[PDB]
């Protein structure tokens, strides 16, 4: 299971597009509402609980910040970084508090 945060940056959202210029930037705009409606919040809690109960290794999706670089590129780089050192519940709590 993959759970994304609310308020994903535009530089990260550019990674999801081949042509951000012609894009209408709709990425995650329907997913982000589930962090605020009640049913979506319940579903997110169930996703986290099932990850605790069934997952052995968790990773965080993290992206670089392009606007701080002197490069031409504005599209961020995304990667999964493994969370080591603890129980699955501990590393999920750590990742949850590190979201955004």
């Amino acid at each position: 299971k993959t759970v994304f945060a609310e308020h994903i940056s535009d530089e990260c959202k550019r990674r999801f597009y081949k042509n951000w210029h012609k894009s209408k930037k709709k990425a995650f705009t329907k997913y982000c509402k589930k962090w605020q409606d009640e049913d979506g919040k319940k579903q997110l809690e169930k996703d986290f609980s099932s990850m605790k109960k069934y997952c052995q290794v968790i990773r965080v999706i993290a992206h670089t910040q392009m606007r701080l670089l002197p490069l031409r590129q504005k599209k961020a780089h995304l990667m999964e970084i493994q969370v080591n050192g603890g129980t699955v519940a501990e590393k999920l709590d750590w990742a949850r508090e590190r979201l955004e």
Partner: peptide, 11 residues
């Protein structure tokens, strides 16, 4: 991964 260590990022 060994769970004895503190929680940390690997990359």
């Amino acid at each position: 991964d060994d769970p004895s260590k503190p929680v940390h990022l690997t990359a």
